[PDB]
Design a protein around this nucleic acid. Structure first.
Ligand SMILES: [Mg+2]
Ligand SMILES: [Mg+2]
Ligand SMILES: [Mg+2]
Ligand SMILES: [Mg+2]
Ligand SMILES: [Mg+2]
Ligand SMILES: [Mg+2]
Ligand SMILES: [Mg+2]
Ligand SMILES: [Mg+2]
Ligand SMILES: [Mg+2]
Ligand SMILES: [Mg+2]
Ligand SMILES: [Mg+2]
Ligand SMILES: [Mg+2]
Ligand SMILES: [Mg+2]
Ligand SMILES: [Mg+2]
Ligand SMILES: [Mg+2]
Ligand SMILES: [Mg+2]
Ligand SMILES: [Mg+2]
Ligand SMILES: [Mg+2]
Ligand SMILES: [Mg+2]
Ligand SMILES: [Mg+2]
Ligand SMILES: [Mg+2]
Ligand SMILES: [Mg+2]
Ligand SMILES: [Mg+2]
Ligand SMILES: [Mg+2]
Ligand SMILES: [Mg+2]
Ligand SMILES: [Mg+2]
Ligand SMILES: [Mg+2]
Ligand SMILES: [Mg+2]
Ligand SMILES: [Mg+2]
Ligand SMILES: [Mg+2]
Ligand SMILES: [Mg+2]
Ligand SMILES: [Mg+2]
Ligand SMILES: [Mg+2]
Ligand SMILES: [Mg+2]
Ligand SMILES: [Mg+2]
Ligand SMILES: [Mg+2]
Ligand SMILES: [Mg+2]
Ligand SMILES: [Mg+2]
Ligand SMILES: [Mg+2]
Ligand SMILES: [Mg+2]
Ligand SMILES: [Mg+2]
Ligand SMILES: [Mg+2]
Ligand SMILES: [Mg+2]
Ligand SMILES: [Mg+2]
Ligand SMILES: [Mg+2]
Ligand SMILES: [Mg+2]
Ligand SMILES: [Mg+2]
Ligand SMILES: [Mg+2]
Ligand SMILES: [Mg+2]
Ligand SMILES: [Mg+2]
Ligand SMILES: [Mg+2]
Ligand SMILES: [Mg+2]
Ligand SMILES: [Mg+2]
Ligand SMILES: [Mg+2]
Ligand SMILES: [Mg+2]
Ligand SMILES: [Mg+2]
Ligand SMILES: [Mg+2]
Ligand SMILES: [Mg+2]
Ligand SMILES: [Mg+2]
Ligand SMILES: [Mg+2]
Ligand SMILES: [Mg+2]
Ligand SMILES: [Mg+2]
Ligand SMILES: [Mg+2]
Ligand SMILES: [Mg+2]
Ligand SMILES: [Mg+2]
Ligand SMILES: [Mg+2]
Ligand SMILES: [Mg+2]
Ligand SMILES: [Mg+2]
Ligand SMILES: [Mg+2]
Ligand SMILES: [Mg+2]
Ligand SMILES: [Mg+2]
Ligand SMILES: [Mg+2]
Ligand SMILES: [Mg+2]
Ligand SMILES: [Mg+2]
Ligand SMILES: [Mg+2]
Ligand SMILES: [Mg+2]
Lengths: 199, 88, 67
RNA sequence: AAAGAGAGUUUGAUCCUGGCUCAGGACGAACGCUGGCGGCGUGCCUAAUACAUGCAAGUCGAACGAACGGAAGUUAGUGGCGGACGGGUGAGUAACACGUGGGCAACCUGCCUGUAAGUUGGGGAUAACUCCGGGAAACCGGGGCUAAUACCGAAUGAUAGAGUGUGGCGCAUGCCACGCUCUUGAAAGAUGGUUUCGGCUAUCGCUUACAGAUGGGCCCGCGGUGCAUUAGCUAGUUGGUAGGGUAAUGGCCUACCAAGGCAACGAUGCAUAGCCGACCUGAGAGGGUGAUCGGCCACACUGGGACUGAGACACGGCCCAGACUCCUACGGGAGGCAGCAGUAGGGAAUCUUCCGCAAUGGACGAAAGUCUGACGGAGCAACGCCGCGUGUAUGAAGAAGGUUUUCGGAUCGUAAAGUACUGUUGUUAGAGAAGAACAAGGAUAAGAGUAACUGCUUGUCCCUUGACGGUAUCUAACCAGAAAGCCACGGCUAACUACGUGCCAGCAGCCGCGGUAAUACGUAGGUGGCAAGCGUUGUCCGGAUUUAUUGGGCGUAAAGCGCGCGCAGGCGGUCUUUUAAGUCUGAUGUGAAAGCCCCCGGCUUAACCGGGGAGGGUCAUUGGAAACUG
């Protein structure tokens, strides 16, 4: 992807169960390193705001320059700023493939999108940062079709989000509607990041 | 003398010409009297949009085209209207 | 200096090799305790050599990475 | 709708005033360690220092005078047009140079378009060439003969000049239209059709005149640097009367008369600087800058002058003087990269002696076409801004190994190994766009003009061509294999332990660390920030309310003249009528294109392009209101 190191360690540092549910923090939920089972100290406002920014950035696994560019682009929309930021971050094609259930995590949908296996409106796209819109259709164009990875990922599914309509019979996915801040992770604080980028 | 040139604009390997009235001497993409259209060579039929009133007046008081500009791009029939107005 | 001005520089790092009549690059800065020294010598620029067996903070002092 | 973050340091501790330092953004950057790819841009900021060498401006045989062919066609010379465009640099310049808004009843305008009259007859001579005279030599004269759309007169023709007559007007000098007498004032032919044998003709050229368009010239209001440890400056200077000169008004110049003019609202003098659209920063007002892109100005080794032309006092033109360089037979000759590449030098620092006229635009030509270092493209450089790689999913109370240990463990860590997948990228083999529509030529159809064709204008059909380049793109097979580093970890500021060292070595932006237990020095383990980058230095804005209009102060912290008389200036009690300078407001014109911002669209997305708007002025003409200031 972009950062190819271990994935449990980053979730242990932040203190949330990103990349799924709890399987990273089942044992030893403390920070990595020789230290970590010792203690933590009073984290200042810089620490708190940086922590929230790392929460968002490491959840979707995108570099900081792209993160700030997406923040600035979201700033132009109407309404709030953090809400629009997370909405645009949800619009990304890489995320939508994960939401439909074609992959397992964020770091597998990225590889499955860059290697051309995903097409939108009948034409391939190799860009994980492509911003999907309403009404476009998402498919596989039998570029892979019947492969072990996709077939396995279609078994473990939980429930797809309400704002995405996925047709497993033809592997055709769509985006029904723009999401709302209620139906996101919500295990973060979107108000902190605006203050962090204000300084 | 006054002519009707193209004034190339766009990116490398992807040109997009305007249609300007200019005094020959001046640079290609330099100062120009007035712009009266565009010209996109890339499309299947070329998309061209020319104002039929300004072009007619400019031809009718001195300005004359330059090969590709108008003189071949006036498939809209501007030169036919000029023909009729000049005889009438 | 090459503009006809004589200044006083400082040699950072542990152990240099430059003697009299040698050519070097200098950069701005200052050493707070030293009275007149108000520039630094760039290490590994023209004839200065990088500090021997320096392991970290190695872009400064001009030491090439070990193999 | 937009709307502003603080922290460390004076004390044994306080609260204030006060400086210093740090946290953000940006580069035409450079240096240090590293370095995979693609798209789009950028690249002598210093010596306006000096040039080895290749190119960067020519073209017409359908305007005219020789050889090869055997009847076409091809170059030296006279002539026509171009060389004043295109390209470069910022030296000079504090001024109508530039920006914005106007005047010109005070002006010029080749080529382009429309219109109205003509294109009638003569003459003399020169280049080329041929001889002689110089010089080995580049480098010049004399004798003789030739053509023109070369040159010079003549016939006819002016809204040009003079003397008028008559109207209609303006803003003072004055402007528009008509008629009368005279005086002056031109031309060129070349390629074709034709009748009938004389001429009569098709375009494209020539001459005169009037309109339009384009391009220029002159004048004016307002606007944008520092210094008063720079106060007087000016003698064609200011005005006037005649004249000269210019396309044009004008002390632009001259002869005479007078003694004026500018200036503390900054004259004059010195220093620095091309100006703008715009760029960086800021909550905004502001502050700093004038790379690239576009508009204007100036310059072309330094200084002066003019010729040719519609246009120049002319980058690759001429004359003279100066410094430098190069040939010389010693009488003399030649040159100007701040055009594209490139060399030396200066510097901390900046690129290839590349391919092509296929696209767009120039010059010449009737046209084919010729020339275009403009331009279209390619090489170099992480110099920037975007994009995605170096894999993915499962996988243990957790192997080996490092580090640490109060010796039970903790950590690196699902990380590895193992099992199952993928080919962005890489390798190979295959295909393989657009950018190209013309110009020319050949067919018909219709119009204007003609006595009739040839031809001209317009429409409809054939007709062939790419530097980039086998580049963009696409298909199929193969292997997780080739593809991560830099800085920091005492506080500000996110992230701690072990060994060595012993006020030494050293670190450092500030507070400050090091004197045998150092989270601050050096290494190691792991941790944090960013990632084909990461740091340091230099410069600018911020935070700095630290020049405070928005937005500060003067009893004791820096800061009230020792006090009065007062010119200029600043401000001014109550009411009525009036004006319309300030003030508010409607309309018209403009404030170019690109750039910032709003809305759509096209490149697989994004940077990047395109289409449509808005915004920006103490801006001009004109019409309103009369509360406040005048
Ligand atoms: Mg380390
Ligand atoms: Mg004190
Ligand atoms: Mg800074
Ligand atoms: Mg490399
Ligand atoms: Mg290497
Ligand atoms: Mg220069
Ligand atoms: Mg010929
Ligand atoms: Mg010839
Ligand atoms: Mg020129
Ligand atoms: Mg020029
Ligand atoms: Mg240019
Ligand atoms: Mg300039
Ligand atoms: Mg004419
Ligand atoms: Mg004769
Ligand atoms: Mg002779
Ligand atoms: Mg003769
Ligand atoms: Mg005559
Ligand atoms: Mg007259
Ligand atoms: Mg009268
Ligand atoms: Mg005949
Ligand atoms: Mg006949
Ligand atoms: Mg006079
Ligand atoms: Mg002055
Ligand atoms: Mg100077
Ligand atoms: Mg200067
Ligand atoms: Mg800039
Ligand atoms: Mg910029
Ligand atoms: Mg700002
Ligand atoms: Mg401020
Ligand atoms: Mg500059
Ligand atoms: Mg420059
Ligand atoms: Mg240039
Ligand atoms: Mg020079
Ligand atoms: Mg002349
Ligand atoms: Mg010239
Ligand atoms: Mg030259
Ligand atoms: Mg050059
Ligand atoms: Mg060479
Ligand atoms: Mg060199
Ligand atoms: Mg040097
Ligand atoms: Mg060409
Ligand atoms: Mg040809
Ligand atoms: Mg040539
Ligand atoms: Mg170019
Ligand atoms: Mg570098
Ligand atoms: Mg560079
Ligand atoms: Mg994995
Ligand atoms: Mg265990
Ligand atoms: Mg071990
Ligand atoms: Mg491939
Ligand atoms: Mg075609
Ligand atoms: Mg034709
Ligand atoms: Mg015929
Ligand atoms: Mg494989
Ligand atoms: Mg901390
Ligand atoms: Mg250090
Ligand atoms: Mg520190
Ligand atoms: Mg790390
Ligand atoms: Mg990290
Ligand atoms: Mg990147
Ligand atoms: Mg600066
Ligand atoms: Mg301030
Ligand atoms: Mg104060
Ligand atoms: Mg005091
Ligand atoms: Mg007193
Ligand atoms: Mg005082
Ligand atoms: Mg007093
Ligand atoms: Mg008074
Ligand atoms: Mg307006
Ligand atoms: Mg504009
Ligand atoms: Mg789009
Ligand atoms: Mg644009
Ligand atoms: Mg636009
Ligand atoms: Mg408007
Ligand atoms: Mg009143
Ligand atoms: Mg009054």
């Amino acid at each position: 992807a972009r950062y190819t190191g271990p994935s449990w360690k980053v979730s242990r540092r932040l203190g949330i169960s990103l990349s799924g549910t709890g399987k990273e923090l089942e044992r030893r939920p403390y920070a990595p390193g020789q230290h970590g089972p010792t203690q933590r100290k009073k984290i200042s406002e810089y620490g708190l705001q940086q922590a929230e920014k790392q929460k968002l950035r490491h959840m979707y696994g995108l570099t900081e320059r792209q993160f700030k560019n997406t923040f600035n682009k979201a700033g132009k929309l109407q309404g709030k700023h953090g809400e629009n930021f997370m909405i645009l971050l949800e619009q990304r094609l890489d995320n939508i493939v994960y939401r439909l259930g074609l992959a397992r995590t964020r770091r597998a949908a990225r590889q499955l999108v860059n290697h051309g296996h995903i097409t939108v409106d009948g034409k391939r796209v190799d860009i994980p940062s492509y911003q999907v819109s309403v009404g476009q259709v998402i498919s596989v164009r039998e570029k892979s079709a019947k492969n072990s990875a996709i077939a396995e990922s279609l078994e473990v599914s939980s429930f797809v989000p309400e704002y995405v309509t996925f047709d497993a019979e033809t592997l055709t996915g769509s985006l029904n509607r723009l999401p709302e801040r209620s139906e996101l992770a919500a295990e973060i604080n979107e108000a902190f990041i605006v203050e962090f980028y204000s300084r | 003398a006054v002519k009707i040139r193209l004034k190339r604009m766009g990116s490398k390997k992807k040109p997009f010409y305007r249609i300007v009235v200019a005094d020959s001497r001046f640079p290609r993409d330099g100062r120009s009297i007035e712009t009266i259209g565009t010209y996109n060579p890339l499309l299947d039929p070329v998309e061209v949009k020319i104002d039929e009133e300004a072009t007619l007046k400019w031809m009718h008081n001195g300005a004359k085209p330059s090969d590709t500009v108008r003189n071949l791009l006036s498939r809209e029939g501007i030169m036919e209207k000029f023909h009729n107005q000049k005889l009438g | 200096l090459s503009n006809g001005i004589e200044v006083t520089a400082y040699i950072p790092g542990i152990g240099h090799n430059l003697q009299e009549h040698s050519v070097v690059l200098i950069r701005g800065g200052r050493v707070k305790d030293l009275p007149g020294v108000r520039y630094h010598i760039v290490r590994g620029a023209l004839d200065t050599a990088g500090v021997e067996n320096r392991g970290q903070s190695r872009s400064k002092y001009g030491t090439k990475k070990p193999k």
